């Protein structure tokens, strides 16, 4: 019947769905960056060894 509460509930749907997506993306990103930092550290060690040989 009323738009005003209707778009209120629509932006509520926006809030909860973006929060759920942000939760999943942030946790997966935490794990992914936690392993990618170790991989990049191994790459940095390889680069340092190549620099010493060079």
């Amino acid at each position: 019947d009323d738009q005003f509460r209707k778009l209120l509930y629509k932006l509520d749907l926006r809030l909860f769905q973006t929060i759920s997506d942000q939760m999943t993306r942030d946790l997966k990103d935490i794990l992914d960056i936690n392993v990618s930092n170790n991989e990049l550290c191994y790459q940095l060690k390889q680069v340092l060894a190549r620099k010493e040989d060079l």
């Binding site: 680069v47 190549r50 620099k51 060079l54």
Partner: protein, 51 residues
């Protein structure tokens, strides 16, 4: 690492150029001894310097 790669490339180019120059100078000196002053055109007073 890229900067040191460029430095090594320049140094290796200089080393190859210097070694090529040294070998070219050695062969050029040998050829100049063989083809210029050991022939019959050598002045007889330089025959003892050559000896």
């Amino acid at each position: 690492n890229e900067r040191l790669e460029a430095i090594l490339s320049r140094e290796q180019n200089l080393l190859e150029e210097t070694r090529k120059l040294c070998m070219n100078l050695k062969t050029n000196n040998k050829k100049r001894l063989t083809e210029k002053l050991i022939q019959k055109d050598l002045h007889p007073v330089l025959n003892k310097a050559m000896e």
